[PDB]
Amino acid sequence: TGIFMHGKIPTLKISLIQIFRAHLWQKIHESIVMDLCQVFDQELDALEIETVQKETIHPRKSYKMNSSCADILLFASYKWNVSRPSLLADSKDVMDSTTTQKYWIDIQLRWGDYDSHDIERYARAKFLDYTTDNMSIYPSPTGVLIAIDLAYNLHSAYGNWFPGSKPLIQQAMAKIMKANPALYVLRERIRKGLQLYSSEPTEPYLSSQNYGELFSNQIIWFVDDTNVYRVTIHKTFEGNLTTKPINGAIFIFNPRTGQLFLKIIHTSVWAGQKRLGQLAKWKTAEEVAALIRSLPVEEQPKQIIVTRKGMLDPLEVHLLDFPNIVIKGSELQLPFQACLK
């Protein structure tokens, strides 16, 4: 990695080795190189780019923080008016510095700390130190260097800008930062190491692995509200395709006794409602709760399985008087909507 350890913090060293396993630094660099290749390959006949080449570099070029070389090489159709070197965020461009035929693009990955996560100053310093260097090797006297701060997920660029390059580089870098496979792997590994989640709790959930344990002697109810609001659509050759609402049915199936409770809903209920999608959920939940209250405690269910994720919260609200009933979502789509066929 390009992570510099300031002291032997062994726990941090182990964590960073686990986070950047399977050569993640090189893979991130290669993915960003490919992304820049594609974003420059598309606009080659509009930016007057004769061709774009991926420079053959060392496999450990991602690791070299003392020196650097070029990752992308752009050969111009005719010529490029090089502007004065400037940061990626600079709106004003003095497009009268020099001229060129070759353009080099360097992508530098860094793991910034709290005191040194300023990526603009880093990119400027690295560009100045590498362009004016006898150790760094570049294929042209003009180019741009893109700096990525993975620890803070910042991005910037410094150096020369030929016309039509700065907005394209900005948009491409924004898209890469927002979405990238290697970057996504980095985020997921860091999340797993830190062990904090974006509200994805684990709850009882009908998968295909606990399907066998479903078949017990306890009362189970499969509740389905797919066919609550439904219309029939038919296309006519002479005219136009037309739709007609039809009555709905709530399924309260009981796999133990085979009792299929069918709540038939007329089309008149959806008369003056703007939001039918949640009205169906609330009507179905009300019917389920009423049916639970109707049955005796011996025949009352203690495990309600719902075939649609939308009817998990409404049941929890309408079963607020029955805490001893578990409401399980089903990730596998049971064919309970086909019984009306």
Binding site: L196, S199, P201, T202, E203, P204, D313, E316, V317, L319, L320, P323, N324, V326
Partner: protein, 71 residues
């Protein structure tokens, strides 16, 4: 036997919510004698459960077989 042992020792839903702490939502101290003790998502908003989690009766505490003999 293995199924019973796993049910007795496996993670329970309430004990699953116990070890989940909301990020950024500072909670008032619950137990005076131990400030380290915290319910986590249990009884606190953000857990995603509208209804209260029930006690897994497979984790009930009961006396040993030889302690039944003494009784």
């Amino acid at each position: 036997r293995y199924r019973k042992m796993k049910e007795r020792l496996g993670l329970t839903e309430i004990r699953k919510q116990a070890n989940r702490m909301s990020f950024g939502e500072i909670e008032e101290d619950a137990y005076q004698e131990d400030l380290g003790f915290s319910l986590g998502h249990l009884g606190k908003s953000g857990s995603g459960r509208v209804r209260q989690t029930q006690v897994n009766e497979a984790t009930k505490a009961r006396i040993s077989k030889t302690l039944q003999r003494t009784l």
